[PDB]
Design a protein around this nucleic acid. Structure first.
Ligand code: MN
Ligand code: MN
Ligand code: MN
Ligand code: MN
Ligand code: NH4
Ligand code: NH4
Ligand code: ZN
Ligand code: ZN
Lengths: 368, 180, 368, 180
DNA sequence: TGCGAAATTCCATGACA
DNA sequence: ATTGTCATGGAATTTCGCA
DNA sequence: TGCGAAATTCCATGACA
DNA sequence: ATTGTCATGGAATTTCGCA
């Protein structure tokens, strides 16, 4: 403050203040003649308050804050002080957007067998059809083979009724879903344990995580739409038609229909493939086992030029889920306890609870 | 001749009437000929309409080339004939009053009777588990269960315990008591 | 049909059917032994129906359709026939997504003078504040200088009341807005003509077109949010504070505040720039005129690797604006009358009306 | 000494009472000293509160270093003093009862009177156009209008016609009739 | 051991949430 | 305590039919 | 006529619709 | 009959302070 600025006025050298400019008193303040003009050098003790007044005018970031200050002031390493405040502005931290993208997506392995994993989800509400408003969509992870059930609500009870009908055929090892009320209820938990089924949940608000079923929803709606062109939206009677139609459609990249991947032979449906007519069932199944292992698997794409990947003990912020109007889009900062994989983390949320969370719902807190 | 395959032939039949379970009285039985895989559907009657309603569910998953049945009224109606024709399913009838399938239908009748006793009215709920049992039951002729043959894989519900399937002492007496 | 297939069975050459494979009769049909297996060759007269039955199973595109057919059939140039049908499937054409991106955005010139152009828009509804729910945002094109007015509705009448207050200061040449009810009403048209103001409209559902104000909305909400952290959302009293705060904030890329760009001198606000203290007003204004011409101008970015640009007489489809559930996302095909610029077109919509339309709300109809 | 600039000094004053126009009686007059640019605000009273309410609008656009006024009650109140202090505006008073600004205030009084006749009650609506006129009016001393000086550009509403500003024969007689 | 055309594969784009 | 996906239709690349 | 650090500029990212 | 925009904060690049 007044200590540092004293030695300066007489003309001795202090670290940070370049010796080649002339520093003087005038109007009761220490000044300095810089190329841009004459600026006041405030005492170290005044600087925090200044940076703060500047930043608070419009809660501006680094440069826009600095340009306000530089209008009247100069001191050594001004931006360092600006950045210090930005890092401590609760309001900027929870309101500003990020400008670093997530790391590149994972392409988890395809389940090895049919019934290893189901992805499940609800579509709707849809226009009423015979008093029904939702569709339960169950997608086998390995085959893509999909079951459709109309329901009146996305409820646990309607979920159980449908899955009892489906699990008549086979019981899956795992069933993966989002954290919706219907799948997280204890009633559903019991129903699963009762059967040796493990429940897997997607991180919250990240449907990419159950992308298989989300994606299948797209085909389901797309085909319903086409079949409903210029007629009233009576979808109930078409569920069975759509289910069959999709289960027997080729994926160009795989060169197989989900039906084939499930049974290794077409049923009596139009254009049934006949290639294995002369093989015994047992020979057929052996060629199926081979087909299942050799399916195309996508690889993780290149990182975008400005991504971040989570590091343990990093300060990060979770996105507010359903933020009210004129309220911040981000939660207060929190700490990365564990890096489950490069795209998934456990955070201690300052309450503090352990939350498992996608990096897509995260930003790295700015200014360290 | 080409080898036998799944979906080549479905064998359907009704079982009932049974005691009322949640409004249902009968069971449509569908057994795939090659695999011995069984599907069961509760109906309220052995009618053409109940058959079409149930088969619509099944034929949403897989369509047989041929359906085989006895000459039950539900199966010989021309409604049912029209239904099959619409789906390119050829219909096939055993002559009136006259292998692997036959045994399966025995297993089903018997396994029902077993569990139907003590709870003659709760069978609707048991259909799923009955099927799972039937379908993960080892076939002495083939080295495989119907599940294995259908899907080419082991199942997550193996029924390692082959059961009595026979009626114990307590049950014979309370089956002779229920039917009084 | 039976003509072409006849010469073939005897073993003579027809264009399209390779001479090196053996073609024969069996079961009443012409067959052929191809590497993949034995396929039926249908008569030319049967082929359209086949392609159609195949395509209709799940309304599948090129490959997924072809793979169904190839299960039973072979004929010359099968895909050509598949593509012919896809091009005539009304339902596929209006339901499928595009897979070609728009051409690269234009960066129109900055208005040369303050008051040359205003961009205007409404924000809201917002939580009630003193009975107010909307904000009228008026942004000067050249300066960024922005006026804020709270309103009860996004109505013409409230628009006129506000613009009368603002145009007390100066009258603009042009006022640009979206095609909202409030700006397209005849009452507003009259109010503008009455004053020598030209009305400019954005193409429909393309706010990028008035991006200046849309973007300013973001800062307006962002700053209101920060100032409202942990207090009840009483925004009415803050409009004047926000307006001032923003008008006097630096754009890092320009190195100027909109206020400076408008007046060439700061008013009595915190951290007022003093660089022109010694110049006469007239010298100041002369340096302002120079500053205004030399502002940074962004350039049009690179095209994405698979973009399309509109060509006159091309078949294209306009996106349905507020499509109902399970209804197509695209209108029927239509023709490009005029290419206004590479990102804007006039289409005859088959009704047929002339509509001016952004290419972002367009897809090029598939399969010619 | 440094040259005169816009926002160096605002000159404010009230005009009124006037005939009721849409509930308003007075006009706060703000003239920027250097440029001669005029802002007008309708008020219901020449009170400190009406002054702060109106100046809040203006000071949302630009803030003067100094405000100059006569010793009107609205301007000498300590509420108004507190208001100015809050914004770093220094207050400046002409001594009781005692250039470019003076002429502008004349123009305003006169131009109002002109248009106020025939429609003494519709003045509220006319304020915008009155300002535009005043501000695109050529200054004989400087080569420029206040608009030009404020913004450094020509305006899209030049008032090429300098007007009588004087009261015609029909108006003198109906001003002598209205005020009866 | 090479050419023109057809077939197949590649892959950006967008939509499910 | 967990993780994107895949139909689509022009373009790019490979294969086929023929010498 | 070159070094280390500070200042400035670059620019991807995302959010307004 | 018309058209994206720009605050943001790490990284990249340039400039400064000094010999
Ligand atoms: Mn029978
Ligand atoms: Mn006075
Ligand atoms: Mn979903
Ligand atoms: Mn908007
Ligand atoms: N994995
Ligand atoms: N332009
Ligand atoms: Zn802040
Ligand atoms: Zn189609």
């Amino acid at each position: 403050l007044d200590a540092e600025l004293d030695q300066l006025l007489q003309g001795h050298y202090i670290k940070g203040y370049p010796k080649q400019y002339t520093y003087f008193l005038e109007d009761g303040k220490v000044k300095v003649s810089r190329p841009e003009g004459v600026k006041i050098i405030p005492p170290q003790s005044d600087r925090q308050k200044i940076v703060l007044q500047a930043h608070n005018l419009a809660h501006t970031g680094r440069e826009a804050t600095l340009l306000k200050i530089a209008n009247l002031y100069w001191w050594p390493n001004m931006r360092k002080d600006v950045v210090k405040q930005l890092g401590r502005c609760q309001q900027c931290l929870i309101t500003n957007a990020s400008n670093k993208a997530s790391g590149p997506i994972l392409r988890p392995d395809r389940p090895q067998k049919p019934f290893d994993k189901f992805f499940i989800d609800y579509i709707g509400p849809l226009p009423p059809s015979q008093g029904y408003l939702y569709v339960l969509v169950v997608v086998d992870g390995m085959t893509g083979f999909t079951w459709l059930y109309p329901t009146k609500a996305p409820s646990t009870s309607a979920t159980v009724k449908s899955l009892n009908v489906l699990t008549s055929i086979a019981i899956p090892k795992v069933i993966h879903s989002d954290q919706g009320a219907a799948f997280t209820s204890s009633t559903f938990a019991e129903w699963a344990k009762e059967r040796g089924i493990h429940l897997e949940f997607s991180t919250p608000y990240h449907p990419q995580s159950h992308g298989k079923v989300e994606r299948k929803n797209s085909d389901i709606k797309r085909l319903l739409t086409k079949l409903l062109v210029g007629r009233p939206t009576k979808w109930y009677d078409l569920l069975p038609v759509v289910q069959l139609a999709l289960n027997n459609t080729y994926s160009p990249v795989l060169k197989y229909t989900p039906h084939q991947l499930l049974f290794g032979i077409d049923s009596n449906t139009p254009f049934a493939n006949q290639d294995t007519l002369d093989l015994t069932r047992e020979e057929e199944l052996s060629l199926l086992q081979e087909i299942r292992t050799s399916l195309y698997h996508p690889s993780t794409p290149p990182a975008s030029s400005r991504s971040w990947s989570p590091v343990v003990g990093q300060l990060v912020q979770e996105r507010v889920a359903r933020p009210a109007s004129l309220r911040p889009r981000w939660h207060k900062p929190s700490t990365v306890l564990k890096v489950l994989n490069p795209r998934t983390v456990v955070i201690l949320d300052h309450l503090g609870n352990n939350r498992t969370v996608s990096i897509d719902n995260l930003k790295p807190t700015s200014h360290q | 001749d080409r080898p036998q395959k799944p979906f080549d032939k479905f064998f359907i039949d009704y079982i009932g009437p049974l005691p009322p379970s949640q409004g249902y009285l009968y069971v449509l039985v569908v057994v795939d000929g090659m695999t011995g895989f069984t599907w069961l559907y509760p109906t309220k009657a052995p009618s053409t309409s109940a058959t079409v309603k149930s088969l619509n569910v099944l034929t949403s998953i897989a369509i047989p080339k041929v359906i085989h049945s006895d000459q039950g009224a539900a199966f010989t109606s021309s409604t049912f004939a029209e239904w099959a024709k619409e789906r390119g399913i050829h219909l096939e009838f055993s002559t009136p009053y006259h292998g692997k399938v036959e045994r399966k239908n025995s297993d089903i009748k018997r396994l029902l009777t077993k569990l139907l006793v003590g709870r003659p009215t709760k069978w609707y709920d048991l259909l799923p588990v009955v099927q799972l049992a039937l379908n993960n039951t080892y076939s002495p002729v083939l080295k495989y269960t119907p599940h294995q043959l259908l899907f080419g894989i082991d199942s997550n519900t193996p029924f390692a315990n082959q059961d009595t399937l026979d009626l114990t002492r307590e049950e014979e007496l309370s089956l002779l008591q229920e039917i009084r």
